[PDB]
Design a binder for these strands. Sequence first.
RNA 1: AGGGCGUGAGUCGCGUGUUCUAGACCCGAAGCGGUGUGAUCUAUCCAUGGCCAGGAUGAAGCGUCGGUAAGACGUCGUGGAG
Length: 87
Amino acid sequence: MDAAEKKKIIEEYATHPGDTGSPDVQVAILTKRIAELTEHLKVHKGDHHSRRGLMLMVGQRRRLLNYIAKNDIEHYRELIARLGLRR
RNA sequence: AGGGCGUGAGUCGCGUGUUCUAGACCCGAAGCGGUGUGAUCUAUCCAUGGCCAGGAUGAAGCGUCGGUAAGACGUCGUGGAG
Ligand SMILES: [Mg+2]
Ligand SMILES: [Mg+2]
Ligand SMILES: [Mg+2]
Ligand SMILES: [Mg+2]
Ligand SMILES: [Mg+2]
């Protein structure tokens, strides 16, 4: 998250070239952040405050995915298929 | 002074009684000491071999599925532990 791969993620998950805040981009960014924080917590199992931040990110991503699936179910399926298949 | 002790037959053989030192009239311990013999029984150990019909039970592990942010965990199969 030195903004390099963040911009990369924004551009390769954007719906249109100017898109930077749509639910797809938000879910992609949140998933990358959840992965990074999961690794950090695996290193530091005792970081309860960061784990709470991780849970907040998880819930936010869940609500965004719920909105996406409520609007366009096939788009939701494609997005989650790209993003870890929702296991 | 009074008193104690003292004022010629012995000695050597043989026999014999008792006795001394020797096992000492004879028999009998449990045990003590010295030096050896034994681990072909048995106790433990050491090296090197053998052996344990048959039938049960179903531990880890692994895998599937479910679960989760990752899990834990659940489920099923597999597995064959003591
Ligand atoms: Mg004595
Ligand atoms: Mg002795
Ligand atoms: Mg003796
Ligand atoms: Mg000997
Ligand atoms: Mg022997």
